[PDB]
Amino acid sequence: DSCIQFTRHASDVLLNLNRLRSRDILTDVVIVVSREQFRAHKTVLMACSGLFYSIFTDQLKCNLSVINLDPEINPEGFCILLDFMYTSRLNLREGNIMAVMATAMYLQMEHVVDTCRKFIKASE
Amino acid sequence: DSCIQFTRHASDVLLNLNRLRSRDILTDVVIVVSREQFRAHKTVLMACSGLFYSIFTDQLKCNLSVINLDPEINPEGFCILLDFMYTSRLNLREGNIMAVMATAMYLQMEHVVDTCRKFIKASE
Amino acid sequence: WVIP
Amino acid sequence: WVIP
Ligand SMILES: O=C1Cc2cc(Nc3ncncc3Cl)ccc2N1
Ligand SMILES: O=C1Cc2cc(Nc3ncncc3Cl)ccc2N1
Ligand SMILES: [Cl-]
Ligand SMILES: [Cl-]
Fold it and tell me: Domain B1-124 class?
């Protein structure tokens, strides 16, 4: 086509979605991790994670307001990944990299799994 | 902080939200324009438009599944702006610029209003 | 704004 | 990935 494109549009949309999350506006699901609860928007979770995409396209699960993750999932690792979903920023540190990579593998967030693998390989 | 950032994350999120819109997945509102109906996600509409942000933060309207726009709004102008919200791409043409600018002013999409004003000024 |  |  002959469209023009606003370079900062996608980033501005994501910043506003994160502002809605902060203020708990139109959040439609609670993700439960080892008795730690995280409110989010189903559409953002689906756009970022192969696992949530599969969950919320299921005819029965699409209607659930609460999702319980596998008990092996670390709440801090989940929190870091939820922040990444809404900001593009990943708080990757020596002390959390193993939990973050394990959580990203479970959530099916291929780009996060890739950078964790590379950061681990650099330290060996 | 000491975060790393994935450059293409915001664009990838928006592309996936547009794929959900195309497949009518988790759309939670119908926007009615001169008897033309457009399904969308409330959160994406709020992230892009000052008008929808005001509508869906209202305690009564946040619960509506149908929103009727002012009868002066042109369905094609709305369609072009809805496409822009989900893609960052604006199909601005000599034949639609007046309807697009009028719709963007009503929806409170300041960056679109800005480029329409500049494109009109260049043709005078 | 840019030409994509 | 970049340093923002
Ligand atoms: O690593 C990843 C990130 C990711 C996101 C999604 N999401 C969607 N895919 C396609 N159409 C719509 C959506 Cl919402 C699916 C798989 C994966 N895998
Ligand atoms: O031109 C524009 C575009 C736009 C978007 C919004 N959205 C939000 N603002 C702040 N926090 C959350 C959201 Cl969702 C408000 C006003 C305008 N004006
Ligand atoms: Cl990812
Ligand atoms: Cl805009």
Answer: alpha beta
